[PDB]
Design a protein around this ligand. Structure first.
Ligand SMILES: [Zn+2]
Lengths: 290, 95, 70, 189, 286
């Protein structure tokens, strides 16, 4: 019964944010926690929620799992509608990629003895940027099976080889002592609409008019900036006429481009004045005494 | 001996710790970005621990950085040169 | 997706970054930088870097591994 | 048995009376100290929590496999306000629905030491609701049993229905200590 | 007051939505109540984490309600151990509006945090408003001689995210959030949302006044006092002084728009010049 390469680990929206928040706050400690969820089948591992284990002391490494903290947190989470078993553990790798070290391999073996399908999720809060989180799910490769000449997992699909392994992970034992499980994200309409409220400006701000004294001064200063930029823009036009195509860009390094700054000033000023004008016009009839 | 176990166990916890690179803060770029220079080495654009004060990290402050991430771990007092330490702790002879 | 690609290339700027000195721009995407480690490297420049700030003797943050100007 | 119990202690103004030596407040503290201790040895997993029956009910301590914390809370309980028995059982029943382990059985211990100022219809319908959730409330009719002997009679009879001694209505006449009659009552048996 | 603004992080919203879903799964619940954890910065609250607590209320009587405060203490020690800088800053409940017993629950919450802030997080995805409505308990000293009571005073709420929390949110909103719309279009959409938000607020007042007129609720005499100030503040845009000033200011911005558009067109002509030169040069060598 070899595990399938098409196995997927599903991380909920709540779970992903908790490890990112816990991992970032614990930078650079390899802060660990337990992933609650359910092994739906031989091909799916759902991570409904996670919770963070405390750090026993100083040291940038994964500490031993505290059994009293785990058991009495699991017991107390069951009271508020979370009767979900532990499907693995997560820990942070603050900036040096997502892989498993020697200590991480030993920690995973503790989970593998209890649950054979335990998943080691590594999250990189430092390398994670907006729209792309550096995450990976790992499960150990048994040395006895692979040494004798057996692949760690069967490949009955194309699903598990869509993500090219990183060289940093391949260096640190990927595909040698552990394998990567493809991570898919479970997002619903409800949670997705709720997250859309982030940075949603209040209705008061839309109709609020900017101070006209500062608006005119900003109008004043930026227009004065184009006065010098236009003077420099004229020089840039003549200079580029008599100037070789190898220096079309090299000569632009270290020297400001009047054309680029003129566009930015025009773009900034056009939205500043149009919005102020439209907001003033809307407020004229919306807030009327008659 | 019960005390022998405590000292032996203390060593095991002490073995898991890793040394930290000693540097010097040059300038704080952002709230979470710092420019530090190694004592004998290059200058790096590093981060800092959230739990740290970030107000005691004035430019020129000696700091300890993580070996891997180079994140600032703590701020240290001005280093006393061992030669200078031997200068102060030199016995005159009760003359 | 262009905005997503622009957003996702910023992970090359993740700390820690070794600090270099901009020496000479060979072309648009490549330049010579002097890392504080004491070695001069011919590396690439991230396309989302303001080339107007690449003045001579300008301190630049380089990738800790590839020394690229990020 | 593996059951979770809540003690509905009473701190009404009538708890200052010396009908029970030395004080009804002090007598009921010994009563809790014995009944709570009894539930501990019946099953080590048994859960005991404290709910005050003042003018407004206040859950001092929820269900816990601890005894000492119950008495420390009872030490700070001072006589104040009037009994509100209607809301006391429901607020105690609400905590029973949110117990540590759902395999535990419902059980509520009420210290009625002030008259229940409600109509018989409301008291009867409360018993039917507790019988729905298989909740057994054990009440000692000490204090003013001369006027509560009828309202509480409908309470236990409706809860116990026609079969099964789920709840008891043991009524101790005033004397040396109501706790001395508790060890002979079916509550502690 | 003691709080100037409450900042609710996206993690709290997801936790509250999940909390309502999991307990709501087993049994139909009017609302679910939890504890808000966060830090304090000047006078702006920074609600950043939350955990669920057992809670139940009888619908018939507001007085009967149970909150497992021993669970509340036990779970705090968990979160304090992991993150010591996150302290109890209030509670939350997912009920669409305030409840009568909320002032009673706050008193139980007040003993752990003296300036407790109740944030109502609506699980239902409202189209216009933010899902969070922060309140604080204050003593409303009436001038009519009625005794002072405990009332909830509204505190402005804002959804803000930590740098790492924002990173995960943009990952989850990667596909649906459309960032191609320019800044100018975004501000106009804000103005449309401002018009919709103001309209909804005005209908709420009109609905309240309609019920007052027909006797459904009595006259508050604080809303009516407030309403007279609202209509008195309505400016007269037909004054000659304001119209001349509006015309004078509008023309001041128009010339700047005209100057920017004038610069834009010729810069566009320069780009067309370069394109035709590049096209002509490319075809000459080929
Ligand atoms: Zn690790």
């Amino acid at each position: 019964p070899a595990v399938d390469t098409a196995e997927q680990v599903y991380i909920s929206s709540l779970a992903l944010l908790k490890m990112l928040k816990h991992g970032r706050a614990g930078v650079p400690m390899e802060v660990m926690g337990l992933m609650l969820g359910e092994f739906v089948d031989d091909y799916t591992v759902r991570v409904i929620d996670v919770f963070a284990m405390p750090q026993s002391g100083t040291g940038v490494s994964v500490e031993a799992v505290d059994p009293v903290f785990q058991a009495k947190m699991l017991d107390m989470l069951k009271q508020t509608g979370r009767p979900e078993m532990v499907v693995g553990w997560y820990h942070s790798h603050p900036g040096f990629g997502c892989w498993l070290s020697g200590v991480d391999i030993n920690t995973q073996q503790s989970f593998e003895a209890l649950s054979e399908r335990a998943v080691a999720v590594v999250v990189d809060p430092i390398q994670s940027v907006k729209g792309k989180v550096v995450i990976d799910a790992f499960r150990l490769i048994n040395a006895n099976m692979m040494v004798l000449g057996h692949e760690p997992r069967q490949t009955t699909s194309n699903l598990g080889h869509l993500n090219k392994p990183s060289i940093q992970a391949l260096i640190h034992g990927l595909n040698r002592h552990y394998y990567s499980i493809t991570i898919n994200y479970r997002k619903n309409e409800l949670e997705q609409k709720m997250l859309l409220n982030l940075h949603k400006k209040s209705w008061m701000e839309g109709l609020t008019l900017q101070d006209y004294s500062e608006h005119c001064k900003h109008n004043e200063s930026v227009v004065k900036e184009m006065l010098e930029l236009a003077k420099n823009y004229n020089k840039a036009v003549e200079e580029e006429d008599k100037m070789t195509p190898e220096q079309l860009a090299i000569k632009n390094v270290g020297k400001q481009d009047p054309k680029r700054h003129l566009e930015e000033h025009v773009d900034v000023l056009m939205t500043s004045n149009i919005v102020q004008c439209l907001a003033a016009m809307l407020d004229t009839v919306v807030f009327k005494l008659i | 001996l019960t005390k022998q176990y405590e000292k032996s166990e203390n060593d095991l916890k002490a073995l898991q710790s890793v040394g930290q690179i000693v540097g010097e803060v040059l300038k704080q770029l952002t709230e979470e970005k710092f420019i530090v220079k190694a004592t004998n080495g290059p200058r790096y654009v590093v981060g800092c621990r959230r739990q740290l004060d970030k107000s005691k990290l004035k430019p020129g402050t000696r700091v300890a950085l993580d070996m891997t991430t180079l994140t600032i771990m703590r701020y240290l007092p001005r280093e006393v040169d061992p030669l200078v330490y031997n200068m102060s702790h030199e016995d005159p002879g009760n003359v | 997706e262009f905005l997503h690609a622009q957003e996702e290339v910023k992970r090359i700027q993740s700390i820690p970054l070794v600090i270099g000195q901009f020496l000479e721009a060979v072309d648009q995407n490549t330049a010579i930088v002097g890392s504080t480690t004491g070695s001069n490297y011919y590396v690439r420049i991230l396309s989302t870097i303001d080339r107007e700030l690449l003045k001579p003797n300008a301190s630049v943050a380089l990738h800790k591994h590839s020394n690229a100007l990020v | 048995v593996l059951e979770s119990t809540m003690v509905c202690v009473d701190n009404s103004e009538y708890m200052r009376n010396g009908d029970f030596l030395p004080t009804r407040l002090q007598a009921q503290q010994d009563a809790v100290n014995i009944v709570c201790h009894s539930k501990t040895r019946s099953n080590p997993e048994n859960n005991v929590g404290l709910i005050t029956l003042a003018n407004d009910c206040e859950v001092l301590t929820t269900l816990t496999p601890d005894t000492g914390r119950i008495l420390s809370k009872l030490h700070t309980v001072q006589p104040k306000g009037k009994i509100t028995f209607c809301t006391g059982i429901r607020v105690a029943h609400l905590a029973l629905k949110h117990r540590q382990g759902k395999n535990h059985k419902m059980r509520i211990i009420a210290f009625v030491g002030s008259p229940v100022e409600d109509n018989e219809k409301d008291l009867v319908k409360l018993a039917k609701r507790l019988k729905k959730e298989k909740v057994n409330v054990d009440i000692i009719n000490f204090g003013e049993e001369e006027v509560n002997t009828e309202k509480l009679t409908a309470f236990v009879n409706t809860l116990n229905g026609k079969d099964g001694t789920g709840s008891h209505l043991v009524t101790v006449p005033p004397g040396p200590s109501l706790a001395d009659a508790l060890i002979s009552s079916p509550i502690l048996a | 007051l003691a709080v100037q603004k409450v900042v609710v992080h996206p993690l709290v919203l997801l936790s509250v939505v999940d909390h309502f879903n999991r307990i709501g799964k087993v049994g139909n619940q009017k609302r679910v109540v939890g504890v808000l954890l966060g830090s304090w910065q000047k006078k702006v609250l920074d609600v950043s984490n939350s955990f669920a607590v057992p809670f139940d209320e009888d619908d018939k009587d507001d007085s009967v309600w149970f909150l497992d405060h021993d669970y509340l203490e036990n779970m705090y020690g968990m979160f304090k151990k992991v993150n010591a800088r996150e302290r109890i800053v209030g509670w939350y409940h997912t009920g669409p509006k305030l409840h009568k017993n909320d002032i009673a629950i706050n008193e139980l919450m007040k003993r752990y945090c003296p300036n407790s802030v109740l944030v109502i997080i609506d699980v239902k995805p409202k189209d216009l408003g933010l899902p969070t409505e922060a309140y604080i308990s204050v003593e409303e000293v009436h001038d009519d001689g009625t005794p002072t009571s405990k009332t909830f005073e509204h505190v402005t709420s804002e959804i803000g995210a930590e740098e790492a929390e924002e990173v995960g949110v943009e990952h989850l909103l990667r596909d649906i959030k459309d960032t191609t719309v320019g800044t100018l279009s975004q501000r106009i959409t804000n103005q449309v949302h401002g018009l919709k938000g103001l309209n909804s607020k005005l209908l709420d007042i009109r609905s309240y006044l309609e019920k007052v007129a027909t006797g459904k609720l009595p006259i508050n005499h604080q809303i009516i006092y407030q309403l007279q100030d609202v209509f008195n503040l309505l400016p007269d845009v037909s004054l000659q002084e304001f119209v001349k000033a509006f015309y004078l200011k509008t023309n001041d911005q128009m010339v700047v728009v005209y100057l920017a558009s004038l610069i834009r067109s010729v810069v566009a002509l320069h780009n067309l010049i370069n394109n035709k030169i590049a096209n002509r040069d490319a075809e000459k060598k080929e």
